[PDB]
């Protein structure tokens, strides 16, 4: 669960 970043706070989570 890294920080979201470009993905946004609403975006999907990685890895």
């Amino acid at each position, epitope marked *: *669960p890294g920080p*979201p*970043g*470009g*993905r*946004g*706070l*609403t*975006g*999907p*989570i990685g890895p």
Partner: antibody, heavy 116, light 112 residues
Framework: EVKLEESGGGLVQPGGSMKLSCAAS????????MDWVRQSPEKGLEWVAE??????????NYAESVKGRFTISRDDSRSVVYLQMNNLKPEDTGIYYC???????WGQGTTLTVSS | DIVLTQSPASLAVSLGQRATISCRAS??????????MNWFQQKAGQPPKFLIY???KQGSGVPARFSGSGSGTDFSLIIHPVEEDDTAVYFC?????????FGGGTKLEIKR
């Protein structure tokens, strides 16, 4: 201050084409995941397309109902996202919003009308 | 597709009272210990504005009276104390899987 402005909407005949543009500022654009979302009274809010950042290979994805007809792209040097729409249908009518950081930020929207 | 079903469709709440809006997902939106459920407010003539993320976390500069709860398939947005400016349609939205999907919206009417 974040700012998204979309343009290029209007009227087009069924089967025709239209290209929407989204100008963005106030965040690192090359890192941002950008999307298009549309709204209509019939279908509500529909996610249309995604384009990921350079680190994620500008990977695109689309709603099943627009696959093969819509193409999302971006110019990282100008901070613009594009949505090329081909073989438009009356059900594609609606307000098209450009969004940044997935859905953190939204433009005011541009209206597409598909009618003869 | 993960289908989000909101209830109620609309709601009339007095000033200073609680508004409770539900969202049910057709399957789990849990994802690495975080429920990917966001909430948006759409005021008249405007785009949706992002309020809550990851079920319960507050968007930047979003007033304390908006809070979100839930996990798995059942979520809610609670607005308390309700004010005049909270008249709007509220949408839930899911980022667990592509395609990203929104609920149908719930209309909050302020009683007077």
């Amino acid at each position: 201050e974040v700012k998204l402005e979309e343009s290029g909407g209007g009227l087009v005949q069924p089967g025709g084409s239209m290209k929407l543009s989204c100008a963005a500022s106030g965040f690192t654009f090359s890192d941002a995941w950008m999307d298009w979302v549309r709204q209509s009274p019939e279908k509500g809010l529909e996610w249309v397309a995604e384009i990921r950042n350079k680190v994620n290979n500008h990977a695109t994805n689309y709603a099943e109902s627009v696959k093969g007809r819509f193409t999302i792209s971006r110019d990282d040097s100008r901070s613009v996202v594009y949505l090329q729409m081909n073989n438009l249908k009356p059900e594609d009518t609606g307000i098209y919003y450009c969004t940044g950081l997935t859905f953190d930020y939204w433009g005011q929207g541009t209206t597409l009308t598909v009618s003869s | 597709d993960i289908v989000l079903t909101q209830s109620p469709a609309s709601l009339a709440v007095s000033l200073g009272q609680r508004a409770t809006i539900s969202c049910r997902a057709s399957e789990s939106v849990d994802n690495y210990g975080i429920s990917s459920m966001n909430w948006f407010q759409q005021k008249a003539g405007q785009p949706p504005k992002f309020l809550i993320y990851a079920a319960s976390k507050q968007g930047s500069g979003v007033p304390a009276r908006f809070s979100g709860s839930g996990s798995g398939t059942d979520f809610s947005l609670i607005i308390h104390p309700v004010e005049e400016d909270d008249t709007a349609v509220y949408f839930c939205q899911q980022s667990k899987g592509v395609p990203y999907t929104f609920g149908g919206g719930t209309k909050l009417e302020i009683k007077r």
